[PDB]
Every structure is written in structure tokens, then in C-alpha cells.
């Protein structure tokens, strides 16, 4: 609006003119030259690119992105007809993944509010840092992603990105396409990167 607002009206008024007068004769922009060492700012990583042949095709990506949308429209219905505590990292891990543990029925994920969904994504991501990727883990991730309502809190964007990272890292431990994880990992990365707009993380 005003970079430098005038605070004083234009005796003192006599002085202020003298000042305004003098200043207008002062050069506007002044560059001095200098006759002839940088810190680092810690940037988090990108995704790890897929091992050759593991990178999915766009049409499959677009397909999933498109599919997922429709799936999300369904989730709202259930959440229309109307669990561990929110802070219970240990319960939530156990509840979703077990020892089995509860699948993600709409009956449950539909009940969770947005702060909880986000809470649980974090917890399931922490487990993930420290245990292996099962199919049970995968559905929950999909389910939580499907339940997240936008626009997203930045904190929620960071969390899903870390998760895509973790996925891309686990994807390098694989040694055949037939590995059960490959499709799931590719999907979660594809969702985060295309659906949730983090296009810097996308497999291309």
C-alpha cells in the first residue's frame, strides 16, 4: 500500500521543507562498488527415481489420479451419515496394523476428523520408517489419503511428501517387478505427486 508513509504534515514546517528540498536533490539510487563464504541452507531431498523399468506410464498415473477422485467423492457420502484416541501413537499403530489389525472400513475412516487423519498419517509414516511395507499399511495410506480434505495444511503437505520419499527409498530394495510392494509404492507416490500437487516428487 504505502512503502514509506508520510507521518508528518507539510517553524518546524519550515524545517521540513528544507529537508524535503535537500532530499530531492540527493540521488535516488546510489550504487557503490566494492573492490574485491556462503552458508548452506538445508534442503530436503527429492524422490529417488525408479530403477529402470520400474517407472510407471503416464496413462496409468492419470488413470489412478482420475480414479482416486471418484473414490474420494464416495468417501464424502459415508461421512454424511454423521477408535483409539487421537494422541495415541501406540494404539493407532496397533489398531491399523496389529501384531491382525482393523482394515480401513468406511465405517471407521469416515468417522475420523481431519486433525486425526493427519495425526494417523504421521504415526503410520513413523512406523513405516522403522518397519516393513505390508499390504495393510498400504490400504491405510490410501484410505487416509482419500479422507484428507483440501485445501491441505502445509503441515499435511510436508507429511505426505516424506511418505513419498520413504516410498521411493523402499522402492530400491526391490529385485523384481513381481514384488508386491511395487504397485503400491508407485501408486502412493503418484497420488502425492499428482493428486496432491507435489509435482516435484513425480515419477516421469
Amino acid at each position: 500500500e504505502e512503502l514509506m508513509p508520510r507521518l508528518l504534515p507539510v517553524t518546524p514546517q519550515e524545517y521540513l521543507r528544507r529537508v524535503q528540498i535537500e532530499a530531492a536533490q540527493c540521488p535516488d539510487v546510489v550504487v557503490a562498488q566494492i573492490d574485491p563464504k556462503q552458508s548452506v541452507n538445508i534442503s530436503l531431498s527429492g524422490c529417488q527415481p525408479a530403477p529402470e523399468g520400474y517407472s510407471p506410464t503416464l496413462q496409468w498415473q492419470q488413470q489412478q489420479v482420475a480414479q482416486f477422485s471418484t473414490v474420494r467423492q464416495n468417501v464424502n457420502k459415508h461421512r454424511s451419515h454423521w477408535m483409539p484416541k487421537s494422541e495415541d501413537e501406540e494404539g493407532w499403530k496397533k489398531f491399523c496394523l496389529g501384531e491382525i489389525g482393523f482394515p480401513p472400513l468406511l465405517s471407521i475412516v469416515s468417522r475420523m476428523n481431519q486433525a486425526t487423519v493427519t495425526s494417523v498419517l504421521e504415526y503410520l509414516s513413523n512406523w513405516f520408517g522403522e518397519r516393513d511395507f505390508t499390504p495393510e499399511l498400504g490400504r491405510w495410506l490410501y484410505a487416509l489419503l482419500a479422507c484428507l480434505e483440501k485445501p491441505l495444511l502445509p503441515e499435511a503437505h510436508s507429511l505426505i511428501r516424506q511418505l513419498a520419499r520413504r516410498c521411493s527409498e523402499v522402492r530400491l530394495l526391490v529385485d523384481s517387478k513381481d514384488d508386491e510392494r511395487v504397485p503400491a509404492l508407485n501408486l502412493l507416490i503418484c497420488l502425492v505427486s499428482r493428486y496432491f500437487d507435489q509435482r516435484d516428487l513425480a515419477d516421469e
Binding site: 510407471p56 496409468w60 488413470q63 489412478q64 480414479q67 482416486f68 473414490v71 464416495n74 468417501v75 459415508h78 482394515p103 480401513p104 472400513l105 468406511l106 465405517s107 475412516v109 498400504g138 490400504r139 490410501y142 484410505a143 482419500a146 511395487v182 504397485p183 503400491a184 508407485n186 501408486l187
Partner: peptide, 17 residues
């Protein structure tokens, strides 16, 4: 169909070709 999601995920994994 209360397991629409679980279903949704399996379909999505399975479409990988």
C-alpha cells in the same frame, strides 16, 4: 458397501500394467 476403500485400493494396485 462398507469396504469400498479396501476394494478401491486393490483394484488400483491390480491395474498395474
Amino acid at each position: 458397501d462398507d469396504t469400498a476403500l479396501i476394494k478401491a485400493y486393490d483394484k488400483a494396485v491390480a491395474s498395474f500394467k
